[PDB]
Amino acid sequence: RKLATIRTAGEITPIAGAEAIECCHVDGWTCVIKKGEFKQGDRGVYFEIDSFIKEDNDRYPMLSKQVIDYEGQRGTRLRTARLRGQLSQGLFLPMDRFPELASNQVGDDVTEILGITKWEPPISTNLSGEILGEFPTFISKTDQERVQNLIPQIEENKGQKFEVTVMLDGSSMTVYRKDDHIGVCGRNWELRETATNAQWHAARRNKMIEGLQFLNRNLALQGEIIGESIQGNLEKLKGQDFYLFDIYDIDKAQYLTPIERQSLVKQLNDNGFTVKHVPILDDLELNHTAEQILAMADGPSLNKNVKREGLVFKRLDGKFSFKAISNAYLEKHKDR
Ligand SMILES: Nc1ncnc2c1ncn2[C@@H]1O[C@H](COP(=O)(O)O)[C@@H](O)[C@H]1O
Ligand SMILES: [Mn+2]
């Protein structure tokens, strides 16, 4: 959701050597615009990277040349770009190119009204199993808002403390117990156990079904399956494996705090259910701009010889979380 939102032109700074364009700051994003398209304070529809914008030469002539066939529809995937050393992310169009939003307000999500959908990398061949049912409605999914979209929330949380973990580039995976049922899920579906299903294999490998059966509580262990043939196997692992990053308390419909999650992992491991965790870095006391957070995102991954996709920050009360994706990672890996 909110691929296209009405946002406010922030600081507008010139681009040396290029006089037809200039650099516009939209929340935490930097977005290249045609010169004089906006002034600071102007409103416009901002389209985030990963938006897919169906072909339309009169509304989106600036995307005419990057049109591709994507799930049977012709349009443009909005990706990170660096053109003359200037980072550029997203599309920012003045409001008067959208006469049907004339009465909308700043901050409105105009995604459906504009027909924007989301581009996604092809999901891994062996992570597409047999579906057993919907993703359980009593378990939260694992979406993380971007630090770029959280400027006022980054300031209100000044002084709060955050668990910092490495963001692993795999697939979201959930293993849960609710009363007399234990299932294994992908990002969007609960799956059937088969000999080839990867999620089920990684859950049997670390005995985490037996772990939830030992703990006797309604919990969802949420983590990332990574490894061979999963999103290009950044970490160069052999085989595939699950790395926990969250535990959802189903009965209380809230996530466990980081210390609760580490205590629960401790008791699992200690009882012979060794479930690995995404790498944990130093707790961070928040006193930063989004630019500063974004600058932290680059670094070593689980495999400390590769550059990580980014970092995830989870407040110590478990009630506020976000991710910061490394823009170097986005400029190196075009399928992200
Ligand atoms: N350390 C982490 N904490 C939270 N989520 C993570 C972590 N590492 C990887 N992820 C994945 O990153 C996703 C965040 O959104 P996305 O940018 O759509 O991949 C989550 O849904 C998880 O699948
Ligand atoms: Mn991901």
From TrEMBL:
Residues 161-325 form the RNA ligase domain. ATP 3 binds at K118, T142, Q144, T165, V166, M167, L168, R187, E224, K314, K323. ATP 2 binds at R1, K118, Q144, R146, T165, V166, L168, R187, K314, K323. GO terms for molecular function: ATP binding; metal ion binding. Mn(2+) 1 binds at D50. AMP binds at T142, T165, V166, M167, L168, S172, E224, K314, K323. Mn(2+) 2 binds at E120. Gene3D superfamilies: DNA ligase/mRNA capping enzyme. Keywords: ATP-binding, Metal-binding, Nucleotide-binding. InterPro entries: RNA_ligase_dom_REL/Rnl2, RNA_ligase_DRB0094. The keyword Nucleotide-binding applies. The keyword ATP-binding applies. This is Predicted protein. It comes from Naegleria gruberi (Amoeba).
